[PDB]
Symmetry: C3
Subunit: 486 residues, 3 copies
């Protein structure tokens, strides 16, 4: 009625507050941050293929403006478009600009196929002071500025290109908008001009608009650019009586389009990462991130929270007594264990089976919190210089809606996991106590503080018999029953 | 101190692995597949109304092209549009094609109301070899091709129709685009022609475009189709000085539009199902499916996972002794039960109350997990032939976002439910053991293996008294206390 | 061997049914409603700034139609647009109506900056009987109707305005569409007219459409309105040969645009609320609401459910006897407690620390069950007069998708929380019973009904001694041991 065996668990000086369904804050021994809030100050050039547009945005790249030559033949997973990109060529606009930019970016290559267009009588290769290369008048190198002949002729043009190849063709073409009637006739004889470009099942017809626009690189006139996709088995017809800015060929479209574009001033570095934001690449295994909604590649999901801590250990209670409202700061080789008091003295030993059982159920969630990949490339635009109305409203609402739902998911997930982690570790403690209870049977009594009073002589070999489960109560039953009740 | 009663639970040789918050794989006695991964090879024409466009897509159906007669008067919940649909009439285009298609599909019927249009002087009922009907030159039968009089006159047209009914009217009309100036005047005298169609609050004006398009069904010319909706209390005015393809009347719009369209080659069968995918109908009560994101009617939610298994039973531990050990493959008449060994021999019996408690908390899930039915009809397009740019990017991103969120919900739901199912069945096992402990009082001791050693003689009818809760402990107390401590 | 101490919990005659993972309906002692299903019959003008359009919708307010002067200088968080608003001025349309309406509403102010436009030779300030102001012919007061000179001339207009300020400018301008060729030349001499408005990087060109349209306020002619945003450092050029409806200046755009518009007939009251629906303001702290998907401000999230009940107490079991059989309606000053029977009689007192522990885990739940915000202003349109096709389909699908996901989140959240609530309160009952058992040691036996049979003389400050944890077991031990076993 003297030796005592106590059951307990580890503890630390002070651990980490986490969140459960019950408490807003519970202290636990260990925990892990689930939100990545650090980013690299650069973009990683591998394993994804990045192409730097440099001074050239992707639209000026497709057109072949001065300064964009480095993009001829380029192929990318991610086109890196620079906010300080500048226009170097004839002033132009693109109706549905954003859609052409999307298509070009998503296609993922600039593979241009020259074609001979046998324009009739008109002069070709018109060039401009608004589009110099090294101070020589020039023009977009994928386009061909047609003007009237020396004999003051611009006949109806009528050229067909048939696609019997195995890829869809992208043709980019334009309409010139002069500033005066005199400019219109000086360039194209006819007034008005006009352009119709058609396939079997679609058509674009454009009438030029004559008028003064703001001066840009000395020019008040403009080009408007259009595009036409021609599928295998289809064909394209160019018709004009003036003002056509003609293609010199077509771009090849990939059947599968899986690339995208990222607009950012962040330099390309030397690191390795498959996740890129507009702030730079992330190098992380965390499931969430609060760095930017703009994220391309294999990325954590964007959430609003700055921090979410996942418990990776039991409730922490610091400070002859077992578990019951003390933890053992001295237990450092296990999660649970035995502390005893007999004739030879005292000792503390870790229990492996319960310790492993807790770890398995808690490092059970550490394999599946980290497995779904979220590998995403072409998405939607998510920031905007100026308001546009209905479509931008929807783009913004869709993204806001998505972020709020994932933020909620993240919040709920961690609270649920932590509640489960606490319940599991509390349960494993109780299971250890109950295991010992069953071993002792009638040879001991519950002291109420997580300890058993053992009513018989129990030396260190006997204590160990309890700890390793070889203790036979029958050996000590007579001795114990007699000491208990008399 | 000799008879024994043991508390246990059933088990089987081959269990099923499921997922919880803890383990990737916990074996349980029974489980249920929550993802439908099988489909029917056909579409079921009951209980929803399916209309098969056959060779006629819905736009050609509305126009009245040859081969679309079967659609006259049709009404549908789902219009089945065929990928092998073919054009059978004059080559045409529709600005905002996708939106007219959506409106026609969503409306759910072709109820055409003919109207007398008193066109002045111009000839009516133009026909074409490009649109033959039973080997005779003809035209879209909802449209009226107006051309100049024999006297070479096409006067300014000016007709009004007032909507004094109680439904909104859909008028479909077109503009013919000639290939040459000669054609333009041959047909319409004037050059240019022109069309304006207006109501009180809206207007559409179209100028014909003249030029060479690719030859289709013998024609380089084209018709462009437009539409105008006329609400009750409004009215429509048609003016033209040439090139008008006039309506013969209007379609009735339903006030409530709740139908849709499914593009698929899958045959319509003879089966019964309210859930249709582009791969065929589903016949299922599962809450999720991985067959296709394109799903109309009363359908499981589309998810990325191929399988999600819901535990419908307790942990499975194969291989007298109690539950601490293992389960009892011999217990086939309940979930929990008693196994005993006395002077008369052994035996195994089920406990109904514990079994039924567990089942109530599990099949309960099984009813509120196939929850409410996700009845959806007109949604958005989810497959595309070729990239379009901004709007298509958003449609794809919206769907991808939705699918990832539901896939996440499905994953978490099954793990949460499975964790609860295991917790409940574990709990019910313990409550049975604790029930029996309180019956036995001081007349028995815990053997540690889920069994009680009963310290008095206990025959098959004393055992039954324990199993059905009539055992009075005071009857045996003295004999038991005696055998225990002396 | 006959005093008894019982452990129990409270109960009530009438409780509330809630839903868990396990049960379709568990009755609990207390619960709360999480779905707000009541609204105020008015809009609260505090603390958000509401501006009532009254008879003017926001487009007519921007144009400066008669009756809209009250909106000059207005600033709003939410513009309240009335469905019975009426047109008071020249019949007009706006090609991208919804996008101008969005930009105006989102910008959040009408701050017009007048500019002098030195139009050349043309007459200014055209007025109309269709736009009377105080019963004299007038016009939109932000616009300037230019017509030909008395010399019968309309020379090319070519005016430039430079944005050298620090805010973006919104210019609203129009194009007049006459009804006959005679009207065209009567008003503008030239036929056709024409308008081009451009900046450095954008342009809009419009050809007027001539033709008969339904008479609206005596007019068959129309105006189409367009807009042009001019960033600081940019400039705008107006160029026309007739039919231009000229701006009188520009609206100031905020850099940060965070306001919105709510279309509703609901009157503005005198209450206080930061949540507004089209049905009226809400005054609630619930997390969810089923009143309307249209909700602006700091609002509960819209869900499909009419009711979701969150358990705020333990299970209700209504009706010597401990917690096993049932709870105690008589216990009205705590959640858990002791009931005894002595020599000196019977008695009930509540246990503090058990009651508190349960409340901390449950009150804890709902101060951050309703937590964050849902602070949303400019969103998307969610109700539509008539079908439009592709964009409207996507808007509706996006909102439907959102609502289903939040409705699922709410359902799961309440089921999970309620399960945890019931588990916690069951747990604390058991912890209480085990606390006492650990005190009594060998001086009592578990009667099986949540009570202990104490095997010794125990007076009322022996009973009290147990309740405040002072009870020393070895004081009575051998008295007890003796009546237990002999
Ligand atoms: C030129 O146009 C005519 C129709 O007027 C067409 O038949 C012919 O194929 C066209 N030629 C080319 C080279 O496109
Ligand atoms: C992301 O979280 C960190 C804290 O982890 C915070 O300092 C930072 O401001 C956050 N980023 C935001 C709010 O954009
Ligand atoms: C024809 O036009 C005149 C004026 O242009 C108009 O008064 C009349 O209502 C029009 N008739 C119809 C049937 O629209
Ligand atoms: C759907 O799931 C099954 C497994 O149940 C899988 O075999 C099939 O390929 C899946 N369908 C897909 C991935 O399209
Ligand atoms: C008018 O047009 C001329 C050229 O046509 C241009 O140089 C001038 O800047 C324009 N003036 C204004 C005020 O826009
Ligand atoms: C909202 O819920 C209440 C019940 O709480 C119900 O009576 C009301 O009809 C609901 N509103 C709807 C369905 O629009």
């Amino acid at each position: 009625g003297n030796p005592v065996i106590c059951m307990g668990h580890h503890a630390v000086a002070n651990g980490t507050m986490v969140k459960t369904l019950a408490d807003d804050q519970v202290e636990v021994v260990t925990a892990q941050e689930l939100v990545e809030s650090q980013n690299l100050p650069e973009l990683c050039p591998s394993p994804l293929r990045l192409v730097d547009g440099q001074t050239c945005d992707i639209i000026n790249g497709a057109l072949g403006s001065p300064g964009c030559d480095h993009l001829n033949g380029a192929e990318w997973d991610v086109f890196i478009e620079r906010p300080n990109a500048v226009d170097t060529c004839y002033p132009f606009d693109v109706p549905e600009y954003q859609s052409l930019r999307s298509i070009l970016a998503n296609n993922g290559k600039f593979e241009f196929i020259a074609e001979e267009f046998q324009w009739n009588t008109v002069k070709q290769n018109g060039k401009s002071g608004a589009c110099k290369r090294a101070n020589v008048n020039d023009f977009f190198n994928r386009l061909n500025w047609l003007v009237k002949s020396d004999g003051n002729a611009y006949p109806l043009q009528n050229l067909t290109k048939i696609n019997n190849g195995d890829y869809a063709r992208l043709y980019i073409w334009g309409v010139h908008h002069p500033s005066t009637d005199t400019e219109q006739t000086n360039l194209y004889k006819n007034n008005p001009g006009g352009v119709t470009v058609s396939t079997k099942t679609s058509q674009t017809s454009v009438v030029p608009n004559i008028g003064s626009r703001p001066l840009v690189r000395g020019q008040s006139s403009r080009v408007s650019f259009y595009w036409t996709i021609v599928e295998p088995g289809d064909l394209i017809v160019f018709n004009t009586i003036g003002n056509l800015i003609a293609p010199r060929g077509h771009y090849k479209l990939n059947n599968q389009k899986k690339s995208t574009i990222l607009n950012t001033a962040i330099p390309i570095g030397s690191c390795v990462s498959k996740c890129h934001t507009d702030k730079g690449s992330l190098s992380t295994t965390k499931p969430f991130q609060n760095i930017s909604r703009i994220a391309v590649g294999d990325c954590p999901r964007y959430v609003k929270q700055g921090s979410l801590k996942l418990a990776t250990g039991m409730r922490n209670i610091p400070e002859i007594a077992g578990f019951i409202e003390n933890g053992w700061q001295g237990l450092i080789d296990g999660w649970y264990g035995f502390r005893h008091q007999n004739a030879e003295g005292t000792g503390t030993a870790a229990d492996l089976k319960s310790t492993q059982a807790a770890i398995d159920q808690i490092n059970g969630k550490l394999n599946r919190l980290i497995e779904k990949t979220n590998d995403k490339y072409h998405q939607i635009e998510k920031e905007f210089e100026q308001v546009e109305g209905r479509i931008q409203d929807l783009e913004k609402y869709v993204e806001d809606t998505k972020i709020d739902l994932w933020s909620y998911n993240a919040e709920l997930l961690v609270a649920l996991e932590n509640q489960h982690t606490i319940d599991v570790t509390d349960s494993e403690m109780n299971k250890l106590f109950e295991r010992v209870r069953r071993q002792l049977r009638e040879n001991a009594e519950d002291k109420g503080n997580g300890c058993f009073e053992i009513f018989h002589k129990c030396d260190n070999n006997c204590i160990e018999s309890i700890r390793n489960g070889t203790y036979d109560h029958d050996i000590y039953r007579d001795e114990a029953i007699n000491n208990r009740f008399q």
